[PDB]
Amino acid sequence: NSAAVPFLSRPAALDGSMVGDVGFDPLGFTGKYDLKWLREAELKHGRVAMLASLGCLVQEFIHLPFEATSNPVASEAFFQVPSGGLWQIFTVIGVIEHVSNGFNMSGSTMFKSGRAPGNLGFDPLNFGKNPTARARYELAELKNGRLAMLGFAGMIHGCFITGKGPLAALTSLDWHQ
Amino acid sequence: AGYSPVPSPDNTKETYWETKAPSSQVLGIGKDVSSGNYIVASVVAAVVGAACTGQCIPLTVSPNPVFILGSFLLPYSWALHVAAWIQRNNGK
Amino acid sequence: MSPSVPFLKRPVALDGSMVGDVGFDPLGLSSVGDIKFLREAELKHCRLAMLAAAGSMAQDLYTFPGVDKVIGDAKMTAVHDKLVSQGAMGQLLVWIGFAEVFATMALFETLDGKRAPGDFKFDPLGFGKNPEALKRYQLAEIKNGRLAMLGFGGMVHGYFVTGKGPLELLTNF
Numbered sequence: 001n002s003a004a005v006p007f008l009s010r011p012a013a014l015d016g017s018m019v020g021d022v023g024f025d026p027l028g029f030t031g032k033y034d035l036k037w038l039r040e041a042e043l044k045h046g047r048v049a050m051l052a053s054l055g056c057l058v059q060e061f062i063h064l065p066f067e068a069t070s071n072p073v074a075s076e077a078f079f080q081v082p083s084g085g086l087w088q089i090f091t092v093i094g095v096i097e098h099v100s101n102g103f104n105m106s107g108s109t110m111f112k113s114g115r116a117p118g119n120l121g122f123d124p125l126n127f128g129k130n131p132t133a134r135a136r137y138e139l140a141e142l143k144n145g146r147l148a149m150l151g152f153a154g155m156i157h158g159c160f161i162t163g164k165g166p167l168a169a170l171t172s173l174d175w176h177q
Numbered sequence: 178a179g180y181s182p183v184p185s186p187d188n189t190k191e192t193y194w195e196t197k198a199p200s201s202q203v204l205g206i207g208k209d210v211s212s213g214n215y216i217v218a219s220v221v222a223a224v225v226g227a228a229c230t231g232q233c234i235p236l237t238v239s240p241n242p243v244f245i246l247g248s249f250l251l252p253y254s255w256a257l258h259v260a261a262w263i264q265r266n267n268g269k
Numbered sequence: 270m271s272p273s274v275p276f277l278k279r280p281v282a283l284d285g286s287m288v289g290d291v292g293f294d295p296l297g298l299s300s301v302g303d304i305k306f307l308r309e310a311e312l313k314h315c316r317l318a319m320l321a322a323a324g325s326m327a328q329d330l331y332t333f334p335g336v337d338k339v340i341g342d343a344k345m346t347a348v349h350d351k352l353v354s355q356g357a358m359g360q361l362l363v364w365i366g367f368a369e370v371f372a373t374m375a376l377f378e379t380l381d382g383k384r385a386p387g388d389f390k391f392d393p394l395g396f397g398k399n400p401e402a403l404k405r406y407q408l409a410e411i412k413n414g415r416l417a418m419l420g421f422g423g424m425v426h427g428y429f430v431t432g433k434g435p436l437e438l439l440t441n442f
């Protein structure tokens with residue numbers, strides 16, 4: 001009954017309401033966990049991974065003037081960079097998390113207010129005016145976030161293996177070994 | 178009398194017996210196997226397990242995995258022949 | 270009864286419903302367990318073994334560029350052993366394990382009666398629509414898979430005896 005895994009029954013929780021649903025839950029996580037919590041996690045992972053993948057790609061080509069910020073490899077850059085700045089980013093991200101969630105950062109309490117999953121109210125330029133455009137943007141954001149999760153995973157692991165940046169690794173494939 | 182009901186696994190049947198032999202639901206997946214099948218299985222398992230055990234009695238530092246596996250048929254043959262007796266006295 | 274073995278009674282579990290059912294179960298292995306489970310296993314083995322036989326012949330005939338350097342003169346299980354070190358067999362194992370986790374979900378559905386054994390709804394080119402066709406193609410699949418299980422056993426064991434791949438063996442003998 002699923003549309004993604006045609007030989008498996010459609011997950012009961014997935015009924016086509018949330019955007020991006022193709023009836024893909026072969027392992028039954030939706031029955032065990034709240035779908036709103038799962039979608040919040042999915043969109044957060046996708047957004048962080050989108051930012052991360054663009055970050056690696058831009059990092060390897062554009063660098064800050066300082067020597068501590070001139071590593072084409074993202075993995076190596078993490079350690080070459082000062083630790084104080086990394087911890088500052090950690091704390092600022094934590095503050096942003098707290099404020100955006102409203103201090104309701106738990107599985108039980110996050111959606112007590114009733115805000116839709118993935119909606120932290122961040123739309124400064126107001127690009128969500130048109131409802132149809134907003135639906136298209138929601139599906140595009142989900143798809144691009146999933147793509148970015150997988151892509152950044154590939155980038156970081158290929159950086160571990162090759163020891164080079166993403167596109168340097170891509171263009172320096174060793175065809176003769 | 179106020180105790181909560183005891184949960185038991187799915188498809189749990191009544192296996193208590195005061196007859197000459199249990200009800201063949203005791204044999205589970207092999208409930209529909211024939212008594213002749215159980216007899217032949219028990220004899221074959223006994224012979225193979227005894228042979229594979231004899232091939233390993235003076236255990237070396239590199240015993241044969243297949244002989245180790247087959248040696249477990251001697252214990253298996255006992256259950257097989259018990260099942261044979263159960264299945265002969267239950268109509269099969 | 271038992272058309273296949275005329276001197277034995279027709280297997281109790283086998284009623285002739287399933288494709289390729291000639292009442293063949295001399296040892297009564299269908300009485301133990303669920304016949305749906307055994308049919309899923311049989312179709313898995315059929316498809317895997319016929320892929321394996323075609324692959325043995327095709328590796329004997331052609332090899333991809335640059336594989337000769339890695340495997341040397343290895344054939345069959347020797348190729349396996351050689352490329353486990355390289356990592357090819359590991360990647361195949363990872364991806365097959367993914368597919369097999371999803372096939373585990375499929376088997377659990379089959380045992381509940383939701384899924385027909387061996388049906389993964391994989392029909393891209395759309396061959397099986399004419400219910401008649403699918404009914405023939407199912408019999409052909411079962412028969413070819415059985416023949417292929419036997420053929421791959423023969424190929425591997427001929428390699429064991431002689432050290433030669435199937436067609437290389439057949440050429441010289």
Ligand code: CLA
Nearest residue numbers: 018020021022023024025029030038039041042045146149
């Ligand atoms: C952590 C990230 C994450 C999260 C929280 C979710 C959450 C969700 N996804 Mg999923 N999704 C993700 C990543 C994620 N997704 C990625 C990267 C892709 C691209 C392939 C998709 C593609 C996708 C589609 C196409 C659909 C969903 C849907 C859903 C929803 C229902 C299914 C479910 O319960 O998933 C929960 C899943 C998890 C919590 C992940 C569990 C991971 C396990 C424990 C280990 C995985 C290990 C490794 C990565 C797997 C490979 C192993 C290999 C080495 C052999 C749910 C909101 C459906 C939807 O929209 O429903 C409303 C839907 O149709 N997702």
Ligand code: KC2
Nearest residue numbers: 175176177333334335336337338339340352355356357358
């Ligand atoms: C068409 C698709 C294709 C497939 C499916 C495939 C599969 C495998 C497998 C299977 C798991 C292994 C193990 C393997 C190994 C090697 N491949 Mg190969 N390969 C393909 C294509 C090419 C091309 C175009 C080239 C190439 C090469 C090499 C070299 C280099 C050795 C050296 O130069 O020392 C090695 C070791 C390069 C070469 O030298 O070819 C003359 C080269 O250019 N391959 N290749």
Ligand SMILES: CC1=C(C#C/C(C)=C/C=C/C(C)=C/C=C/C=C(C)/C=C/C=C(\C)C#CC2=C(C)C[C@@H](O)CC2(C)C)C(C)(C)C[C@H](O)C1
Nearest residue numbers: 050053054123124125126127147148151154155166169170
């Ligand atoms: C929130 C919001 C806004 C916004 C916004 C913003 C800033 C949105 C930013 C979105 C971004 C940055 C999206 C990035 C997506 C990246 C992807 C999918 C990467 C995939 C990589 C892959 C597959 C790869 C790879 C690779 C691998 C693995 C290995 C490598 O060797 C090779 C290779 C490179 C090929 C605005 C400002 C408009 C306001 C509005 O009110 C709403």
Ligand SMILES: CC1=C(C#C/C(C)=C/C=C/C(C)=C/C=C/C=C(C)/C=C/C=C(\C)C#CC2=C(C)C[C@@H](O)CC2(C)C)C(C)(C)C[C@H](O)C1
Nearest residue numbers: 319320322323392393394395413416417420423424427435
């Ligand atoms: C279903 C489906 C599709 C599909 C598909 C695919 C990819 C189907 C593939 C089917 C295959 C690969 C079938 C292979 C059968 C092989 C056999 C029967 C071998 C027997 C060997 C023997 C007897 C032997 C032997 C031998 C022995 C033992 C001794 C040796 O010395 C040599 C010797 C040779 C003599 C498509 C793509 C159309 C799409 C569609 O929408 C869905």
